[PDB]
């Protein structure tokens, strides 16, 4: 045979779901492209990782003219 | 690997250097950049060397 | 090098504290050349530390108890 090799899993995906009370700087979702976008009180690393900028509950919304998924953090 | 390792010596007279790579074929010129020298805590021009 | 507890200063002799006065009280080894007096216990007697390297914090305790430090 000729094929038969793969690559190790990268363990992406949302880490803090809706309603989590997160701490400051905690990773919210790992992703390859930009599936979810950065909203209020969140940032975006070079890996397009979305990290909490301030502690509080997470909120998922579909705001935008192109119907894009945003991640924001309430101050609770 | 055609790029060879080169070091950016510090012209401030102190012994401090960065280290990068450079294609000596396409660019035979001598690099120089203004970088930071922690020894002196000032931005000085660094010139390449072996 | 060794460390001298502050409470060890009450077991030495009639008050003079040098290297030899500590090796007689079995507080440091017989090959020790330098020693330090650190703030670890409590000193009551007016001890006179002759030649040692007492710390800043322990120096205040020795003088506050009535002693005096020199070199």
């Amino acid at each position: 045979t000729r094929n038969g090799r793969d690559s190790e899993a990268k363990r992406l995906g949302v880490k803090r779901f809706g309603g989590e009370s997160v701490l400051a700087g905690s990773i919210i979702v790992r992703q390859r492209g930009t599936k979810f976008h950065a909203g209020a009180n969140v940032g975006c690393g070079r890996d397009h990782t979305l990290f909490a900028k301030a502690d509080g509950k997470v909120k998922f919304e579909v705001k935008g003219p192109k119907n894009r998924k945003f991640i924001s953090i309430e101050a609770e | 690997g055609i790029r060879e390792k080169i070091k950016l010596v510090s012209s401030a007279g102190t012994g401090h250097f960065y280290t990068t790579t450079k294609n000596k074929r396409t660019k035979p010129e001598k690099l120089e950049l203004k970088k930071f020298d922690p020894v002196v805590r000032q931005h000085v021009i660094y010139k390449e060397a072996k | 090098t060794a460390e001298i507890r502050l409470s060890d200063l009450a077991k030495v002799e009639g008050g003079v504290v040098d290297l030899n006065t500590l090796k007689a009280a079995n507080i440091i080894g017989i090959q020790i050349e330098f020693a330090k007096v650190i703030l670890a216990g409590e000193v009551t007697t007016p001890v006179t530390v002759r030649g040692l390297r007492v710390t800043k914090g322990a120096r205040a305790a020795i003088e506050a108890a009535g002693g005096k430090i020199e070199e």
Binding site: - | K5, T19, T20, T21 | -
Partner: protein
């Protein structure tokens, strides 16, 4: 007889105040041009042996 200590493992671990051991990070001996400074700078300080490897080191150093 007295237990011989693993002399090789006594040149890489020091016994700290509470009873843990400290060691020096790896990956910082050569090939230092590719590595990012953020990665290099994090490796400079010392570290503490993890709970998994603590049982293995205590065996090697019976006296320290």
């Amino acid at each position: 007889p007295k237990i011989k200590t693993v002399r090789g493992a006594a040149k890489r671990f020091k016994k700290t105040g509470k009873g843990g051991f400290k060691h020096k990070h790896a990956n910082l001996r050569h090939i230092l041009t590719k590595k990012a400074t953020k990665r290099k700078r994090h490796l400079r300080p010392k570290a503490m042996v993890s709970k998994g490897d603590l049982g293995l080191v205590i065996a090697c150093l019976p006296y320290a």
